[PDB]
Every structure is written in C-alpha cells, then in structure tokens.
Amino acid sequence: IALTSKNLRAIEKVCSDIMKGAKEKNLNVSGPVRLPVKTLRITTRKSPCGEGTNTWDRFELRIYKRLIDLYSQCEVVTQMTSINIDPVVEVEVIITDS
Amino acid sequence: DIKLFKKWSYEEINIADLSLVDCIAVSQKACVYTPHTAGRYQKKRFRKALCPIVERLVNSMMMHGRNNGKKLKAIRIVAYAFEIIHLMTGENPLQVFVNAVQKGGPREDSTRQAVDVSPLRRVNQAIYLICTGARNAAFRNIKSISECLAEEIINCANESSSSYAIKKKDEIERVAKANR
Amino acid sequence: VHPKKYGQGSRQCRVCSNKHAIIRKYNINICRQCFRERADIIGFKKYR
Amino acid sequence: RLLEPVPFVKTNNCIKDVDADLFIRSYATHLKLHNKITYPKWCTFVKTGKGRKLAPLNEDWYFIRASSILRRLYLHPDIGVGFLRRQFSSKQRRGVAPNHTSLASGKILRSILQQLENLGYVEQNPKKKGRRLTTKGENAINNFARYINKKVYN
Amino acid sequence: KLNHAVFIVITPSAIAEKYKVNLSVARAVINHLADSQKLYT
Amino acid sequence: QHILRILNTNVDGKEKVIIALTAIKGIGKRMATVICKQANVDPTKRAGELTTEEIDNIVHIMSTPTQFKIPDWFLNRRKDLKEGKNIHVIANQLDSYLREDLERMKKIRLHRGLRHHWGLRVRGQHTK
Amino acid sequence: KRVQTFGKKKTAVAVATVTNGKGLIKLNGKNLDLVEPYILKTKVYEPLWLIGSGKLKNLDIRIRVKGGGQTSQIYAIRQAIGKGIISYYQKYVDESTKKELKDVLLRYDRSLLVGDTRRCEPKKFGGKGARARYQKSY
Amino acid sequence: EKSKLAKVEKVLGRTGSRGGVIQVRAQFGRFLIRNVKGPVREGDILALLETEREARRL
RNA sequence: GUGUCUAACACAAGGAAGUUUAAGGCAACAACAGGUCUGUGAUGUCCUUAGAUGAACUAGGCUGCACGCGUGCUACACUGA
RNA sequence: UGGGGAUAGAUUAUUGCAAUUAUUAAUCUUGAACGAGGAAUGCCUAGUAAGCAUGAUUCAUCAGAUUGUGCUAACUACGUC
C-alpha cells in the first residue's frame, strides 16, 4: 500500500494508524519504506513589471511518498484500507497476496 | 624519514633570518612524501605559517589566468625545476630554494615613509617575486616555465642582480631608503 | 479566421489570458504575476 | 614512469592490472598482424568527430580505436552504439560562441562493433541492450595482459 | 630568427640554444643520442 | 638544394609538406591531409626536399579530384548551379569565379548581391 | 570476517571494506595501481608507509567509490584507508596497537583521521559566483 | 651592507592613515621602535637594515 | 589571561564543528508624487466605439544603418594548440 | 605561426503553411582585426575568487542570456577610517 501526500504530519498520522490497523488483524508487514522526496520547484522573479534589482525567490511544493506492504489475502487488505482512510492522503493498493 | 617525491632528503637546515626558519617548512609535520595536502590555510592570522612551503610555492605557480586550478601541473613544474637545479649544481634543490626565498625577501618597504617587513610576508613576497619573474621569462620566449623558475631560483640563491626578485627587492629597498 | 496551432498564439495564461511571462514548467500555464498570488493556495511555499 | 615498486598485492591477469594505452596499441598491432581487422577503404578518408574536425594523424588509428572500444567492452558489459558515441565525446569550439559537447562519428563505431562481432569477439543477445564479450576474446585479452605483466615484472 | 636548419646536460631547450635550432630538431637529436614532457635524468 | 620552392612561385621549403600545401589553399587542413594521403608522402617531411614529380602528383590530385576516392560532400565547388556539373575550381580561379558570382547576383538583383554592391555584411553588422 | 568505514570530501564518498586477508588493495573492480595521476598515487601510497607491510599482510582492503572528481575521490579513499586501518586494529588486533598506529597517522596529518569541513555555498542572483557580482556602471 | 636581527619586545599599535602599518618595539640591552608591514607578533625578529632612528610613539 | 574584575571579551586545549557553526528565508517606523492602468472582469475620469483606436486576416517592420555610449562572449599562444 | 575565427562562397539536413534580412544544422573551402589593452573603472576573505562545464527557463522552431548545480581548489591582510 502506497501513501503520497504534501503534508508530513498527515502521512505520519496515517503511519501510526496503519501500524495499529495491521496489528488489529495481526498481519505480517514489511516496515514503511519512505521513497525519495520530489520537490516541485519554481524559481520566481519578484516584481510583476520586472523592476529594480532582479531578485528571485524559490518556491517548493514538496511531496512525500511512502510504501508499506503486507502478505495477506485481497479482501482483508481492502477492508482494512477502507476503515483506515482519511481525506487528505493519496492511497494506492497493489496487494495481490495470499 | 620523510623525503620529497620519495627523493629529496630535506632535513638539512639554513641559518637565514631565524624568523624565516620558523616560517619555512623546517618542521617534520610540514614535510610530506610528495606535494599537496591542502588544509584550511585561511582561518587565523598566523595560520598561513603552518602551510608547507612547497604547497605555497605550487599555489603561487598555479596563479595567473590560464594557470588557475592546475595544481598537479604546478607540482610537475616545480618537480622538473628541482631536477634542473640538481643538474646545474649538485646541491639539494629545496635547500637552494630556501636560500632563494631567504635572499628574495625585502628588508624594508615604502609607504606614504618606510617600514620593516613581516618574515611571513617576506617569504610570501619572495615566492611571488620568483614566480612572477618566471612567468615574465616564460611568456613568448624559448625557455619553459620550469627552466625559468629554476634559473630564477639559482640566480636569486647566488644573489645575482639579473634575478627579477633580487632586482625588484633592490629597487624596493632603494626607494624606501631614498624616502627615509 | 485562419488558425495557428503552434507558437505564441497557441497558448496563454489560464487565469488572465495574457501571453507574457507564462510558467509552462510542470504544465502550470499561469503567468508568474498571477501565480505568486495563488502559489500558496496551489500549495507551494518558499524556503530559500 | 613505466614501472614503480609498491608494497600491495595485485590481481595480475586482467585489463584492471594493465597500462591502457600500451595494451590498446599492442592488441591493435596484434590484430593488424593477424589481419582479422580491416580499415577498410572509405574509412581512410573520413573524420572522427566534429568536436575534432581533424582525424588522428597516425594511419593505424582505426585498429587503435577498435582495441580501445574492446577495452571499454571489458569495463562495461552490455553497452551499445549511442553509449559509444557518448563515450568518445569531447568539447566543440562553436566559432565565436562558447563550447558544447560533440559526439564521435557513429559509422566508424558501428563498423568496429559489427567487425568485432563478425570476428566473433562480441555477441549481441536478445537479453538486455547491446553486445557483450565472447569468452575467446576475453581469454585473449587476459593472455595479452599476462604477456605485458610478465614483460614489466622481469 | 635564424635558429632553424636541417644540416650541421640533457634537455631540449639547451640543445636548441647550443646548436641554434628548433625544439623539434632538438628532440630528434635527443632521440639520436638515446640510441607531455620526458625524464632526462 | 635544401629549401626548394613551391607552386606558382612561393618560397616555402622548411615548412612541413602539409604546412606548405596549406599555405596555398586547403588550410582547413582536412584537404591537405587527404591530398598528402592520396600522394602517399610523409606529412612530417620538410617541403624543400620533395622532387618535382611528388609536387606534380600533388598538383594533379588538387586539380583533378575525379580519379581519386574523394566524395562529393568533401568537394570544393560542389554542384555548380547549371545542369552541366563542374567541381573543385580552387585557388585564383575560385576567387575569380566568386567575383563573377557576385557580379551575376548584382545584375539579377539578390539581397546579398545588393549588399555586396553597397558594401554591407551578408549576416549584418547589427546596429553598430 | 569484515569491518566497515568510509571517507567523505565534497561530494565524493569512498567506503572501505577491510576483511581478513593477505595484502590485496582494490578500488571497485580495479587495482589500487590504477589511480593514475602521480601526485594522487603518492596520496594513497602514504598510509601504506605509515602502517608498513607486515601489519597490512593479514588484511585485504576493497574500496567502493561514488561521486566527485579525482582529487576529492583520492582524499576520500585516503581517509577511508586511514579509518579502515584503525577499525581493523580496534575490532581484531588491540586497542594499544591501534592507539600507537593512530599516533603515527596523526603525526603525518589530520586529513586521514578527520574529513574536510569545506562545503559549497549556493549561487544567488546578481552574479556568476556565490558572492561575486555583475559590474556596476554609470 | 650592515643589518641586525632585533627581537620583538612589544607590539604597540596599528599605524598608517589606512591602518596597514604596525608600530613595534624591538630589543637588542637597547630598545628600538620601528614600523612594520604585514603579520607580526611579540617574539618575532625584525630585519633592521637601518639600525638608528626610533619611530615616534603614538 | 584581560574586563567596574560586573555585563563580558582574548588566547590555548578538548571537540565533527567554537563568531549566533556556514549559508539562506522572514524584513519595523516613516517616507519616496520611484516603477507598473501593455498581468489581472482591480480601476476613476477622458478619448473612441461599425468607410471602429474593437474583433479578424494578408504582407512589410521590430535584427534597418555616416555614427556614440553601457553589459556580456571570444581572443591575443608553448604552464599552449 | 599550425595562434585567432571575424568575413564570405559553394551543401545536405532540421522545425514549420511560410526560413527569401545568411532561422537553425552540419561538410569542404575562405583566414579580417588582435603582438595582453590608454584616461578610467568592477567584483572578491575559504571550497569561496578564478577556470571549466552542464540541467532548468523561454521553445513548433534557439543560449553567447538568466537562474540553479557541480568538478578542477588560488593569492592576501586577517584589518583601518
């Protein structure tokens, strides 16, 4: 199960939730794998008319990706996923296991 | 013990100005088996003293335009120059180089008045003078920069007025004396 | 009319329709003068 | 210069023990002696890359280049022609404008690659990207490495 | 200047001075004697 | 004896054979290198010790590319306009022909011809 | 068995693997002999003199290099060898011999015991350098 | 010609209008005061080509 | 060590690092009749609004060239090509 | 001078309806000034300065620009009004 967010705290909250969630059905998990951070970087000139000293500022939209995976039957993981969700994080389910 | 390029013994001392002996790489920890270690040599006021004089000599050689960043080449030029000095006379080139640096350092300098000169500055100026003279000799002439440096060093060590460093030192001191 | 499918007239700032200073990086399609207003609500933050 | 004393142990059988240039020239000379390799014809006339404009000025350069490619093959296993073009890259003086990178000529590389393959020293597999080495070629490179290693040693 | 013709310590510049010749001609004399940069020691 | 002269009375002779040839025409040096190879002379050799026959061969190769393995993309004066092909005009004949081309352009009227007549750069000197 | 260390100057990182052995020194797939520049050849020969042959002769060293150019990589390798030599004598041989060895290394230089402190300063608008600026005019 | 090694006794102060000079007291026996260019501290040794006139105290 | 021997400073040692560790970001008070209505369905007033200063479409022009001043690039070689 | 690549001719390509004010690209040839810059004046103190590159931005078509990023790794005080 892959978790992608732009918010650190929300992704970490989901981490604690999934750890509890896994232990509820006593599942066999591989520890949460944090994938390389992608930052959407815009280096932006200050001034709408391009005045004065040139002056650039660097804006960052930093997205966090993490993956936690489970060896368990298909029904169990989808049902676990549906109880575990919150609106902000992007969830992908890739488990075909048994 | 420690020998430069695994060759030059460089344990022998030179009398010099005493202060100059303190400045040059007489010390065991300033000695190295082949040039270049590059510690942080700007940090404190006297920190430059602690630099190996061969590291300083190569850095001076590395100066100026096309030469910048060619540290290995500056090492090759000095190594070649040491071979040339050894041929010209069977003396240890490093000892000869210390003699040239000792000779080249100005005793007084001129100001808006006239002043004595730091021993660390005297070494820094001497190396600068010898390398600049070598470049002047090199540029648009037959002689290789290694030859020019060797030639300048031997002349300066000898105390020949044909040395660029000796000529400049003589002029600098003479003008300082002329004012005061 | 006679249309042109490429170059300057093929594109604009999505917000203001002006053809100048458009960020096409990451396919934003907003001119930076408009974008700096909205970059926070878009989710960007500056740090450097 | 040619040989210095050192205290550590070495492998003593591969290109990773060898002076690259000496090895490259020797194998090229051996290959030309054998006469497996051919220039051929048109390749006498050509240019080696627009970053140069010129050519190597040595008349045995193609064999040298072939040998040099074979060394790159021993280093890098499954490489292909675009990798070769990139490998042999240099800077190109753009006239008054600043430099930008420029590939070696791709036909000479392709011709060598094909010729080595025809002479059985490399094999394109269905697996992965391009050509890797044949064992007979590797054993020969090792034998030449051994000859040089003995030659320096004694 | 006049330091260039075909017919009549080890280091090429000295040879080029001594016989008044080019460094290419000096190198050729070095090669005949023996029978980048190089080591003359 | 040792510094014998070269094509159209040029006094080169302590120049290398390539360097002498380039000092005529061909000083992009690819032209000289291929001519040297077609001749099969040593490029390291000095010009004034070639015999006349070697020089004549070189002049023949430069003058007539047709019987040599020299491709059209390499050639001086590659297509030459009209349906009747001509190739490799070279030297003073190239200079003369180029003057004729500028005259022809001018008479027709082309922007480049017109700029040549004015005394203006084809690529333009740009304001200054 | 195995003991592990690394060295880190600028980008470059050289990880040293010191196993029980017989005097082999490698750099990735390549022998230590293939560093190539004569100056930098000496820079990695330096620790070999400081520990001599007979203390090298029961260990094999393999080194794994990523990042930087040659002068930085060689200094990272040299640091990795220094730390590597010490780690073997701390894990296998003796603390007292390790202290004696470290004293020798310290006497030669600090740079094969403690890595570089210099790291790049970002470019900022108004000039090609970090601090250097485009020319003012009147 | 004549010269004397003289041992720096006290570093007195930075002099010159732009501050680049330093006033320094030098010990034979006898104290002399002279003005020095570049990095210098107490226990250094001055070249002392001119062995006569004492620089004026600030 | 120095310092009312206070707030604090100086040197050496220890230490990965000893100035707030180095670099950024954020940037008051009060201005400027600085720039920007050609970024904006932010916008007053004024002109114009169908042989339209709108929309749209075809060329030419923005790099023109006796010439002057800014900013940059490339060179003037042999420590190089 | 085989430094230098201004300047020009002849090609086949590339993007596009359109390249013809050399669009851009390469191939061969063509081989200018310039012998290290006068009066003046810019930036810089530690991985900096300088050199050497390259990604990104505009982009159907294009880096000599800007903005980042690295490697090669200096000098000189180390302060003063």
Side-chain angles (χ1 to χ4, degrees), chain B residues 17-19 45-46 107-109 111 115-121 173 177 180, chain H residues 1 5 21-22 34-41 44-50:
Chain B
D17 300 294
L18 306 176
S19 53
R45 183 179 177 209
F46 291 103
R107 296 172 295 178
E108 291 201 310
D109 195 0
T111 53
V115 294
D116 205 291
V117 188
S118 162
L120 182 55
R121 184 160 285 221
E173 290 186 42
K177 181 42 53 197
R180 191 272 293 131
Chain H
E1 76 293 59
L5 295 178
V21 190
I22 309 181
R34 297 296 291 194
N35 294 308
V36 188
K37 181 175 167 180
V40 63
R41 56 83 252 201
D44 286 306
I45 299 172
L46 304 183
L48 206 73
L49 167 57
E50 172 179 287

Side-chain angles (χ1 to χ4, degrees), chain G residues 64-131:
Chain G
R64 187 186 195 172
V65 191
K66 181 173 156 65
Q70 286 212 254
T71 300
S72 50
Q73 282 168 347
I74 271 69
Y75 279 128
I77 291 164
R78 189 181 189 273
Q79 176 60 95
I81 292 166
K83 280 177 184 299
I85 289 168
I86 290 297
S87 70
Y88 198 90
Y89 277 69
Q90 182 60 90
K91 181 171 179 176
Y92 298 108
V93 192
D94 197 282
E95 322 84 77
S96 59
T97 306
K98 187 215 75 174
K99 186 179 176 66
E100 293 165 8
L101 288 172
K102 188 171 182 290
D103 190 73
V104 176
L105 297 174
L106 178 61
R107 282 183 275 148
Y108 202 70
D109 64 79
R110 198 187 187 209
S111 73
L112 44 56
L113 292 175
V114 183
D116 212 303
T117 54
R118 294 172 286 208
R119 302 288 180 279
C120 302
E121 190 172 296
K123 181 194 177 311
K124 180 180 297 181
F125 58 81
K128 65 186 177 71
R131 304 183 181 180

Side-chain angles (χ1 to χ4, degrees), chain A residues 39-42 44-48 50 57-62, chain C residues 23 25-26 28 32-33 35-36 39 42-48:
Chain A
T39 188
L40 284 51
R41 48 164 63 91
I42 310 295
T44 313
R45 200 180 170 197
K46 305 189 190 179
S47 190
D57 52 355
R58 311 85 174 180
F59 290 89
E60 286 192 62
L61 171 53
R62 300 172 177 172
Chain C
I23 308 300
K25 185 73 263 170
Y26 311 131
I28 294 169
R32 96 291 166 180
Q33 60 278 28
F35 186 74
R36 291 170 72 82
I42 297 170
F44 294 78
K45 179 172 166 68
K46 53 173 166 178
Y47 302 101
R48 176 186 156 161

Side-chain angles (χ1 to χ4, degrees), chain B residues 6 32 38 41 43 50 63 69 82-83 94 101 106 117 123 129 151 159 164-167 178:
Chain B
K6 299 285 282 185
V32 68
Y41 299 128
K43 188 180 181 62
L50 307 178
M63 290 296 279
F82 299 148
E83 294 295 296
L94 288 297
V101 167
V117 188
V123 173
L129 260 52
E151 187 174 64
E159 199 189 297
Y164 296 111
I166 297 296
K167 188 179 299 300

Side-chain angles (χ1 to χ4, degrees), chain F residues 21 24-26 31 35 57-65 68 88 90:
Chain F
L21 181 57
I24 305 298
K25 290 275 109 287
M31 179 59 67
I35 295 165
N57 294 334
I58 288 167
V59 169
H60 191 274
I61 295 157
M62 186 54 137
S63 304
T64 299
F68 299 101
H88 213 295
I90 213 59

